[PDB]
């Protein structure tokens, strides 16, 4: 059960126009990679390689997005003066930096 014609009919019903000649990247902000990540992930169980491939795909997306967005002239960098609510709380990142502290201290304490 894979009805390609019906799937394409349904795409045509909802497909908002993303043609680059008429639609700006500031409007869609979606970029597709030019290389399948499953061709760079040989083994699915290999967590390190899997995460590395995911990160590389996201890095390519981020670089292309920055290039297009700077060409279009929208701010990209977050100023050091702009303080706003973050998705992860300040107490949460206090805990995160804390655990990083105990990890580093444990390592150098073993060395000492």
């Amino acid at each position: 059960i894979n009805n390609k014609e019906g799937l394409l009919t349904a795409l045509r019903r909802i497909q908002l126009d993303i043609n680059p000649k008429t639609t700006p990247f500031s409007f869609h902000q979606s970029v597709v990679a030019s290389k399948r990540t499953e061709d760079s992930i040989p083994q699915i169980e290999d967590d390190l390689q899997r995460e590395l491939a995911f990160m590389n795909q996201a890095l390519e997306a981020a670089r292309l997005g920055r290039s297009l967005l700077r060409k279009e002239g929208v701010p990209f960098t977050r100023p050091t003066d702009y303080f706003a609510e973050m998705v992860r709380t300040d107490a949460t990142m206090e805990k995160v930096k804390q655990k990083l502290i105990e990890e580093a201290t444990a390592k150098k304490a073993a060395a000492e």
């Binding site: 050091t80 973050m86 990142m93 580093a104």
Partner: protein, 88 residues
């Protein structure tokens, strides 16, 4: 007790932005503070942090306002420098 500068602890992104971080073991561009407006804002920060708690609300407001005015004057000074070096 050990310093987070000694430990290789990455910077974390909080409400205070990390900004464009500088690479470890590399030349970080030294920014020289020489404009009297810039010493004005730094000295205002130092004096505020030294004086600390003032009971009077208007006094707190005035010290904060002089800090903001020092920052502002530094801002137009830098903008004027930018314009001078960009057209002339």
């Amino acid at each position: 007790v050990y310093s987070e500068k000694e430990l290789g602890i990455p910077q974390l992104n909080t409400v205070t932005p990390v900004g464009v971080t500088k690479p470890k073991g590399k030349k970080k561009g030294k920014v020289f503070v020489d404009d009297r407006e810039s010493m004005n804002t730094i000295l205002a920060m130092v004096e505020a942090e030294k004086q600390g708690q003032i009971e009077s609300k208007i006094m707190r407001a005035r010290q904060l306002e002089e800090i903001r005015e020092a920052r502002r004057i530094e801002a137009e000074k830098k903008e004027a420098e930018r314009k001078a070096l960009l057209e002339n």
